[PDB]
């Protein structure tokens, strides 16, 4: 049996760590909810 436990409030944090790039990708979404790259 799966169970849930609270982990925090949902709030924006000022001066959070900033990372990650912003790729623009061509993708396909199938009937099973899987994304795949189109090339």
């Amino acid at each position: 049996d799966m169970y849930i436990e609270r982990a925090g409030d949902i709030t924006w944090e000022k001066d959070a760590e900033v990372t990650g790039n912003s790729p623009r990708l061509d993708v396909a979404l199938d009937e099973s909810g899987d994304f795949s790259l189109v090339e």
Binding site: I4, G8, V18, S22, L25, V27, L29, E31, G33
Partner: protein, 156 residues
């Protein structure tokens, strides 16, 4: 059970010890997570039971106790925050500028951040603290890195 708004871990005791299989959002008395985290199974909150109310495998979303309530959208311009809730680790905000998934049915925001699979369902937020979607359904790219769609439901 606990019904306070917030981000929650989704755990199971089926495997070794207590294992985190994902994360979700409690808002307006409804629990929101990705379909692949629970497979649509019922959940426990203390002595209370949460039954599935709506779900869709293609969207990879599911709501419990009521209809999907989250309706904020990425503005397509600004940085957002992933409120990552990794297994065994404290909730932590990570700021990023989303990229884009371009599909035959329109464009979706996407976040290029790497976390364990049990982080799926963690919320992505705008600067007003609104949940614009959930992290955890995406693709593996050319260098082995992970890029998640910003997956959002529809408030009926």
């Amino acid at each position: 059970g606990e019904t306070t708004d917030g981000v929650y871990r989704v755990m199971t005791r089926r495997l070794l010890g207590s294992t985190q299989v994902g994360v979700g959002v409690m808002q307006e008395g409804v629990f929101h997570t990705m379909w692949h985290v629970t497979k649509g199974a019922a959940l426990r909150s203390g002595e209370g039971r949460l039954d599935p109310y709506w779900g869709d495998v293609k969207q990879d979303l599911v709501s419990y106790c009521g209809p999907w309530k989250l309706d904020a959208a990425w503005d397509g311009l600004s940085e957002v925050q992933l409120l990552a809730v990794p297994p065994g680790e404290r909730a932590k905000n990570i700021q990023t500028l989303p990229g884009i998934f371009k599909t035959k049915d329109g464009d979706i925001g996407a976040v290029a951040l790497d976390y364990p699979a049990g982080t799926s369902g963690s919320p992505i937020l705008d600067k007003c603290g609104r949940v614009i979607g959930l992290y955890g359904n995406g693709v593996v790219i050319k260098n082995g890195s992970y890029v998640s769609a910003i997956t959002q439901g529809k408030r009926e």
